[PDB]
Design a protein around this ligand. Structure first.
Ligand SMILES: CC(C)CN(C[C@@H](O)[C@H](Cc1ccccc1)NC(=O)O[C@H]1CO[C@H]2OCC[C@H]21)S(=O)(=O)c1ccc(N)cc1
Ligand SMILES: [Cl-]
Ligand SMILES: [Cl-]
Ligand SMILES: [Cl-]
Lengths: 99, 99
């Protein structure tokens, strides 16, 4: 698809068996999802942005379906106000910015 | 161009006669640049990011070149960790997300 940017670029994702809405975010290095359980090991991380930093849990090798396209990678989980699909998974679905 | 996302999508911008680096950020509603002098009056604005809220100065109808494309629109100025080009100006340069 081609997604214009008049509105926030939100898509449906499936993660951990759950359907969620998420923002396709070229400014995010990594994917950050609201608090939820994920299987396996995790380690703490701090991510910084507008407003300062947020503490998250980093889960590796998590499969996400993003608008119907499967991808695997690191997912950070924390009290983000918006689910964000970052570059680490955008690359995997072949996403590009075009102008 | 067609910009892939294996690295940060950084571009050169020109604002107030100065060249700066900025991140093309589809997850940003607004364009936010580090402290600098701009002409005219400004208005208050609060934006919310990953670490919480941030006060900024809102300047309207500012001339800015983004990767060689001319835009004229709102620029928020504040203590952001990186200059970010948000959807308000990405739409002006005709940018879309594609996969
Ligand atoms: C600021 C960027 C360098 C990094 N951010 C991604 C960015 O797209 C956020 C993504 C975002 C979006 C909504 C809420 C929190 C974070 N947008 C953002 O802060 O935009 C602000 C300016 O326009 C406004 O519109 C959205 C809030 C305002 S971030 O959310 O802090 C972040 C940083 C690191 C990772 N791995 C993941 C996300
Ligand atoms: Cl990854
Ligand atoms: Cl590629
Ligand atoms: Cl604008």
């Amino acid at each position: 698809p081609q997604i214009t940017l008049w509105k926030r670029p939100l898509v449906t994702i499936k993660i951990g068996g759950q359907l969620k809405e998420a923002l396709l975010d070229t400014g995010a290095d990594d994917t950050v999802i609201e608090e939820m359980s994920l299987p396996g090991r995790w380690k703490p991380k701090m991510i910084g942005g507008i407003g300062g930093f947020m503490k998250v849990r980093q889960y590796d090798q998590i499969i996400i379906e993003i608008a119907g396209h499967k991808a695997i990678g690191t997912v950070l989980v924390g009290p983000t106000p918006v689910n964000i699909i970052g570059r680490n998974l955008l690359t995997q679905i072949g996403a590009t910015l075009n102008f």
